[PDB]
Design a protein around this ligand. Structure first.
Ligand SMILES: [Cl-]
Ligand SMILES: [Cl-]
Ligand SMILES: [Cl-]
Ligand SMILES: [Cl-]
Length: 338
């Protein structure tokens, strides 16, 4: 007793003829594997080429291949929201109204061009051998107070927003939405915060104890690592949570557009959103999913849906690519943290 995605039978038959699907994705293949296996159970006639790539790498390969008239991906799935919206904003995406997106929220799609697949909170993580939960504040002001402690000097990690597309988006959204972020950033400076472009490199120092606490990394990644890392703790912010959305679109110039429609539909479905939340611990976008990596669990943890600010799948976020907008944030950031 399972659902299938509500893909049009004619799209299924055109996909059967294509026989192939090429994905460029920022989602770790180990994370996506159960999704890929389940999709191939539904559609065994589709061979998948899954290209696990960094966000900038995805954008550069896609626009370079397109520019040269080389064949490129059928489907782009990336946590770099502004780069994905920029490509859809510029006519790279195939217009497609997914039958699985009828109730997709407004801040979760750019018309019939690009869709959110996830709703992923920026959280606090910590090493349980060095900080007890009672020592870990759940507000920006609390964290700024913790980072005044001499013993927290050198013991904090966060993003380097100058070397991560995704770290920029999260910390810029924080800076734009929460006044208390400015007091927290100065505290990063006091505490000699180390800045990472890799969530993995940041978590390695937290796990080893070189840092005790990390700010601004994805709840999805933290829950996944908890499956095997028993010392990693998660604290959800109760004064306001920024959430990012992994955006998918179909290449207008896809060789296999109908296979890509099936895969998009699959990702937005009840079936695909549940499997993603259950297997990958990637926080779902779909509001009805049940489990820890879901909007309902997240709203409960932060004290309500009104405490979550979803970065929207909208051309408004292209202001983050304007140097004038970047500079006000980055000037404050460089000063506060060094
Ligand atoms: Cl359509
Ligand atoms: Cl990583
Ligand atoms: Cl925990
Ligand atoms: Cl929904």
């Amino acid at each position: 007793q399972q659902s299938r995605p509500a893909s049009d039978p004619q799209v299924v038959e055109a996909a059967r003829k294509e026989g192939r699907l090429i994905i460029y994705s920022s989602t770790d293949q180990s994370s996506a594997q159960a999704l890929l296996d389940d999709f191939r159970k539904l559609y065994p006639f589709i061979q998948i080429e899954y290209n696990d790539l960094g966000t900038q790498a995805i954008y550069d390969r896609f626009v370079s291949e397109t520019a040269a008239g080389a064949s490129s991906a059928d489907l782009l799935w990336s946590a770099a929201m502004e780069l994905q919206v920029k490509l859809a904003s510029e006519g790279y995406a195939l217009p497609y109204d997914s039958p699985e997106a009828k109730n997709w929220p407004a801040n979760a799609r750019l018309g019939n061009l690009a869709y959110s697949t996830t709703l992923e909170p920026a959280v606090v993580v910590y090493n349980k051998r060095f900080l007890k939960p009672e020592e870990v504040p759940t507000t920006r002001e609390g964290l700024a107070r913790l980072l005044q402690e001499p013993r927290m000097r050198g013991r904090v990690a966060t993003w380097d927003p100058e070397r991560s597309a995704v770290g920029f988006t999260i910390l810029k959204a924080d800076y734009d939405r929460f006044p208390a972020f400015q007091e927290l950033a100065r505290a990063f400076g006091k505490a000699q915060a180390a800045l990472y472009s890799s969530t993995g490199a940041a978590f390695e120092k937290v796990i080893s104890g070189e840092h005790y606490l990390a700010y601004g990394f994805f709840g999805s990644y933290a829950l996944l690592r908890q499956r095997t890392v028993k010392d990693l703790g998660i604290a959800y912010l109760t004064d306001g949570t920024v959430a990012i959305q992994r955006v998918a679109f179909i290449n207008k110039r896809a060789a296999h557009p109908n296979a890509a429609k099936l895969f998009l539909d699959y990702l937005l479905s009840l079936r695909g959103q549940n499997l993603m939340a259950y297997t990958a611990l990637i926080f779902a976008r779909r509001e009805t999913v049940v489990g820890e990596a879901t909007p309902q669990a997240l709203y409960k943890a932060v004290g309500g849906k009104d405490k979550v600010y979803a970065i929207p799948v909208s051309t408004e976020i292209l202001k983050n690519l304007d140097p004038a907008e970047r500079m006000r944030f980055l000037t404050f950031w460089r000063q506060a943290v060094r």
